[PDB]
Write a protein that binds this ligand. Structure first.
Ligand code: CLA
Ligand code: CLA
Ligand code: CLA
Ligand code: CLA
Ligand code: CLA
Ligand code: CLA
Ligand code: KC2
Ligand SMILES: CC1=C(C#C/C(C)=C/C=C/C(C)=C/C=C/C=C(C)/C=C/C=C(\C)C#CC2=C(C)C[C@@H](O)CC2(C)C)C(C)(C)C[C@H](O)C1
Ligand SMILES: CC1=C(C#C/C(C)=C/C=C/C(C)=C/C=C/C=C(C)/C=C/C=C(\C)C#CC2=C(C)C[C@@H](O)CC2(C)C)C(C)(C)C[C@H](O)C1
Ligand SMILES: CC1=C(C#C/C(C)=C/C=C/C(C)=C/C=C/C=C(C)/C=C/C=C(C)/C=C/C2=C(C)CCCC2(C)C)C(C)(C)C[C@H](O)C1
Ligand SMILES: CC1=CCCC(C)(C)[C@H]1/C=C/C(C)=C/C=C/C(C)=C/C=C/C=C(C)/C=C/C=C(C)/C=C/C1=C(C)CCCC1(C)C
Ligand SMILES: CC1=CCCC(C)(C)[C@H]1/C=C/C(C)=C/C=C/C(C)=C/C=C/C=C(C)/C=C/C=C(C)/C=C/C1=C(C)CCCC1(C)C
Lengths: 188, 176, 92, 173
């Protein structure tokens, strides 16, 4: 579904009255012609696309995880964090870590490993910005071989669109928790 | 031959009126000695600094960020109150911004004050661009004057600008 | 003109420069390090050194050796970012 | 390139020549310094760490006569601390320091190009002659040494968390 003329790229213009910035490339997946505040002019589009894909992946994981945590919690986590939902669970795990319960180091482990991956992948971002072969977001992680050949077009556009939707959705989820105190399911 | 600003004096040789914001005003002849492009860039930077400074001298008197609600409406007192860490972060932000200016001045040639910051694409129309260039220079000059006055008024009265106006203690009692 | 030749250590190269940046032989063992590597190193060193310094500012009578060691990364970060600038303007 | 990390360029210093070279240097630590020095260090650490892992397991299983009286219930780093007072660790340090002075001479030769990193010409039983064998045994040595570095780290830190030696830990958990 690259559909360079229907769903992304070429004359696609989100805002009919104002044309997009010259810097924004049509070849990039997910180009609806949207950059009113001209961020692409200020910053490298490679950096911005890396940031967009990273944010979308993190937010997609966060939304799916909020739903999963609200509907199911592993055997035993209730013992260590009582009943906690969303960011409450994060705070509860950190609290128990401070309290001295060795079982509550989940967030520390998550940080260690995610930061390890980020630290070892940072050179990938620098190489991309230095005109390297790597595209902004591709980490060459396609074990199952799901996105291969024809699917790549739709897979990439679907990734970006689902990631943007998840970026919005996780924000909605977190703020609904901050107000109601409920989960993504309780509210609905 | 004759200066626009001072009709009874000869036009400064370097100031031919082509550059933005030029009315032939150079009674002491800075342009003859110092590099005119450097002077123009310095003027533009000072004007931008003072435009932001004049806006921020009065904005806290109307609204404050919830984190800094306790800080005084007096800008100088708020500066004293902020603390080293926040000032250090502001300094790092300003230095990161000024790295680009360093590159453009010492290792590049460009229109004075051109750092490539035009995200909203308001400078593409040449006529609007000329008006905006002169407007930036003149608003910067006015902000320089106004912010100097504001700093001295805050020194004297130990109050914000709007507070001083409302209390009408316009007149000094001596040195602080 | 009759002075004896001045002995210099082995593998002594010419580091004099009038270019925009030194020749990357100035960086010695780190001459082949990337500019991105230097940037990341400088940022990480700055953060870690500042944190380890803050963990020792009210110095006690038993400071942590690891915090003392890491506090030396703030001075290190300066040289790292200087090297980053040198390595960005020398082609890397 | 970089077969190991497929999204990063192949490390410039690493050309794939050395045994166990999968183009793994994400942080670019081979660009700084001499790769011969790093290989000497890696093989030193490999051999030391795998000796250490086998020693941890073997101390957990068996202890020489009369050592139980000296060390009590100590395990791992506690045994270290206990026997530094006795003097065993001091004697080990003296003899290892002798060997390491001679290894210093060896490293200086390596940096000059005379000596291959990690080669001390120690082959009493004569295992490595079939050039093919040595070529396999070199890969096996590197891989086992890396696995052993990780294993000894895990053993020591499991002792830290629990206070139990490797196999004693594994039995009960
Ligand atoms: C933004 C991402 C994110 C973050 C920060 C967290 C954070 C947390 N999750 Mg997880 N979680 C995530 C995604 C995330 N989750 C996703 C995508 C799922 C669905 C597959 C889950 C499903 C899930 C469950 C069922 C539970 C947690 C729980 C937890 C806590 C301990 C870690 C754990 O067991 O995770 C487990 C996560 C996974 C096994 C999969 C994540 C990694 C994918 C495969 C990549 C912690 C608050 C526990 C808790 O205390 O909840 C409050 C808990 O019971 N999570
Ligand atoms: C997210 C972190 C987390 C935490 C804090 C705990 C904590 C605990 N688990 Mg575990 N457990 C986890 C993840 C976690 N589990 C995961 C991901 C699984 C699935 C593989 C299990 C599967 C599991 C089982 C099957 C059992 C426990 C049990 C227990 C408790 C003993 C202990 C409090 C025991 C328990 O509570 O038994 C009733 C138990 O038997 N857990
Ligand atoms: C649903 C959204 C979505 C989509 C459409 C894609 C699509 C893609 N990802 Mg993936 N990705 C996602 C979410 C998604 N991703 C998330 C949340 C993460 C964070 C863990 C990643 C992390 C990630 C990395 C690190 C990389 C990719 C890559 C890719 C490409 C490789 C081919 C492939 O796997 O096809 C996509 C296949 C699927 C989407 C099927 C799995 C989806 C299941 C059905 C949902 C799981 C839900 C569960 C509750 C959790 C492809 C464009 C590679 C690439 O080249 O990127 C450009 C790559 O290196 N992705
Ligand atoms: C010369 C420039 C300048 C300087 C040196 C300062 C300095 C300061 N301002 Mg700021 N301020 C500025 C411009 C400036 N301001 C401008 C242009 C505005 C209008 C948006 C404001 C609006 C403003 C508010 C509303 C507040 C401050 C406050 C402060 C103090 C704490 C830092 C902070 O919150 O900054 C915040 C600065 C900004 C959000 C804008 C500056 C950056 C722009 C985008 C350039 C500090 C003394 C706080 C304080 O202590 O008030 C009593 C506070 O509450 N400033
Ligand atoms: C935007 C510009 C501006 C504005 C609106 C104000 C406004 C104010 N200033 Mg001033 N001030 C400014 C800039 C400004 N200042 C600058 C740039 C400085 C220097 C850094 C000062 C330094 C300053 C001090 C030191 C003090 C003030 C004070 C004041 C207040 C009382 C003024 C007063 O008593 O006037 C009276 C006006 C005069 C005495 C006029 C000057 C006398 C000569 C003879 C006028 C000549 C006229 C002539 C035609 C001008 C053009 C000639 C040329 C073309 C050849 C008032 C709120 C006072 C204050 O707030 O005290 C608490 C105060 O003490 N200001
Ligand atoms: C990293 C290597 C290493 C280190 C630092 C130590 C350190 C220690 N070992 Mg030893 N140990 C090691 C490897 C190591 N071991 C190995 C590989 C084995 C299996 C044979 C053992 C078996 C062993 C036993 C059974 C005991 C110790 C004990 C000790 C302690 C006193 C010294 C002693 O009596 O050693 C005695 C060790 C030996 C005589 C064997 C050394 C063989 C060397 C390393 C290989 C030489 C290969 C050759 C060149 C071909 C001390 C903490 C004592 C203790 O307090 O245990 C808790 C003790 O009773 N170790
Ligand atoms: C096979 C080789 C061998 C090794 C490699 C070895 C190593 C160490 C180390 C390591 C660094 C220590 C620290 C240590 C310490 C003690 N050994 Mg020991 N030992 C070996 C052999 C024997 C034998 C045959 C005997 C013996 C003993 C003791 C006693 C006595 C305590 C007491 O009687 O109060 C103490 C304190 C005697 C004993 O009592 O054994 C029942 C005894 O006969 N060991 N021994
Ligand atoms: C570059 C660019 C952009 C931009 C932009 C921005 C953010 C532009 C911002 C411009 C600003 C904030 C200009 C402020 C000027 C303030 C002045 C002239 C104050 C004068 C005060 C005086 C004379 C006074 C006084 C007084 C004194 C001294 C004493 C008192 O008793 C009385 C009184 C109060 C009267 C955007 C981001 C849109 C992108 C786009 O692509 C282009
Ligand atoms: C070269 C040479 C020779 C020689 C020789 C010699 C003496 C060679 C000796 C070689 C040795 C001792 C190799 C040891 C390797 C150990 C490994 C890989 C351990 C891994 C542990 C792991 C993964 C673990 C773990 C674990 C962790 C972390 C958690 C723990 O709770 C437990 C658990 C177990 C689960 C000879 C003598 C033949 C002569 C020849 O002429 C020259
Ligand atoms: C874990 C943790 C926490 C946390 C947290 C987290 C995870 C916080 C996450 C916050 C997030 C994800 C906020 C997102 C806000 C999104 C907005 C406002 C989008 C607006 C879009 C608009 C207006 C679009 C407009 C329009 C545009 C542009 C285009 C087209 C049309 C339309 C779409 C309508 C805390 C903070 C609770 C603390 C705790 O101790 C630890
Ligand atoms: C560092 C430090 C130390 C102690 C104080 C404080 C804590 C605030 C802190 C910071 C201080 C700062 C930032 C001070 C800055 C001072 C400033 C900006 C002073 C400004 C002075 C401006 C003056 C005269 C302007 C005079 C203008 C005149 C005649 C104009 C007359 C004219 C007229 C009327 C007609 C046309 C011709 C011409 C010549 C243009
Ligand atoms: C072992 C041995 C036996 C016989 C002969 C032989 C020469 C071989 C000898 C070898 C000895 C050796 C190798 C000794 C080495 C010792 C060394 C390197 C000691 C170093 C000590 C340094 C120390 C504490 C530094 C502490 C620094 C501090 C608080 C700094 C303070 C601060 C920090 C960190 C941050 C905020 C500002 C503030 C408060 C000033």
């Amino acid at each position: 579904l690259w559909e360079d003329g229907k769903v992304q790229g070429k004359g696609l213009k989100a805002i009919p009255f104002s044309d997009p910035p010259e810097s924004l490339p049509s070849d990039m997946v997910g180009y609806v012609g949207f950059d009113p505040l001209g961020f692409s002019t200020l910053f490298d589009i490679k950096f911005l696309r890396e940031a967009e894909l990273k944010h979308g992946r993190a937010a997609m994981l966060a939304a799916a995880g909020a739903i999963a945590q609200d509907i199911f919690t592993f055997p035993g986590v209730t013992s260590v964090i009582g009943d906690a939902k969303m960011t409450g669970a994060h705070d509860a795990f950190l609290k128990a870590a401070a309290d001295g319960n060795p079982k509550a180091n989940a967030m520390s482990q998550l940080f260690v490993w995610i930061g390890f991956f980020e630290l070892v992948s940072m050179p990938a971002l620098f190489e991309t910005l230095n005109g390297g072969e790597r595209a902004p977001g591709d980490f060459y992680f396609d074990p199952l071989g799901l996105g291969k050949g024809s699917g790549r077009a739709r897979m990439e556009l679907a990734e970006i669109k689902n990631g943007r939707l998840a970026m919005i959705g996780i924000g909605g989820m977190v703020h609904h928790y901050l107000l109601t105190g409920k989960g993504p399911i309780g509210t609905i | 031959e004759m200066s626009k600003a001072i009709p009874f004096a000869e036009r400064p040789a370097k100031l031919d009126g082509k550059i933005p914001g030029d009315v032939g005003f150079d009674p002491l002849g800075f342009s003859d000695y110092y590099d005119l492009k450097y002077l123009r860039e310095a003027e533009i930077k000072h004007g931008r600094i003072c435009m932001l400074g004049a806006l921020g001298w009065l904005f806290p008197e109307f609204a404050k960020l919830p984190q800094f609600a306790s800080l005084s409406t007096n800008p100088l007192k708020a500066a004293t109150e902020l603390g080293p860490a926040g000032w250090a972060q502001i300094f790092i932000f300003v230095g990161a911004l000024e790295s680009f200016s360093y590159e453009k001045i010492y290792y590049g040639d460009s229109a004075p004050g051109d750092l490539g910051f035009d995200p909203l694409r308001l400078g593409k129309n040449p006529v609007s661009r000329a008006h905006y260039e002169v407007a930036e220079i003149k608003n910067g000059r006015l902000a320089m004057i106004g912010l100097g006055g504001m700093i001295h008024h805050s020194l004297l009265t130990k109050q914000g600008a709007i507070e001083q106006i409302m209390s009408q203690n316009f007149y000094p009692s001596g040195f602080p | 003109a009759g002075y004896s030749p001045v002995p210099s250590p082995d593998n002594t190269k010419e580091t004099y420069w009038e270019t925009k940046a030194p020749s990357s032989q100035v960086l010695g063992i780190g001459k082949d390090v990337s500019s991105g590597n230097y940037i990341v190193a400088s940022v990480v060193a700055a953060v870690v050194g500042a944190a380890c310094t803050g963990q020792c500012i009210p110095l006690t009578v038993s400071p942590n050796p690891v915090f003392i060691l890491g506090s030396f990364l703030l001075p290190y970060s300066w040289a790292l970012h200087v090297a980053a600038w040198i390595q960005r303007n020398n082609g890397k | 390139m970089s077969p190991s990390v497929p999204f990063l360029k192949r490390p410039v210093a690493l050309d794939g020549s050395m045994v166990g070279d999968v183009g793994f240097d994400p942080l670019g630590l081979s660009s700084v310094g001499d790769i011969k020095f790093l290989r000497e260090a890696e093989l030193k650490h490999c051999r030391l760490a795998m000796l250490a892992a086998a020693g941890s397991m073997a101390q957990d299983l068996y202890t020489f006569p009369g050592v139980d009286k000296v060390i009590g219930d100590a395990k791992m780093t506690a045994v270290h601390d206990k026997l530094v007072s006795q003097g065993a660790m001091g004697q080990l340090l003296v003899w290892i320091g002798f060997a390491e002075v001679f290894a210093t001479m060896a490293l200086f030769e390596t940096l000059d190009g005379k000596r291959a990193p990690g080669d001390f010409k120690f082959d009493p039983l004569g295992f490595g002659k079939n050039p093919e064998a040595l070529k396999r045994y070199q890969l096996a040595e590197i891989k086992n040494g890396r696995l052993a570095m990780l294993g000894f780290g895990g053993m020591v830190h499991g002792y830290f968390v629990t206070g139990k030696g490797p196999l004693e830990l594994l039995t009960n958990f």
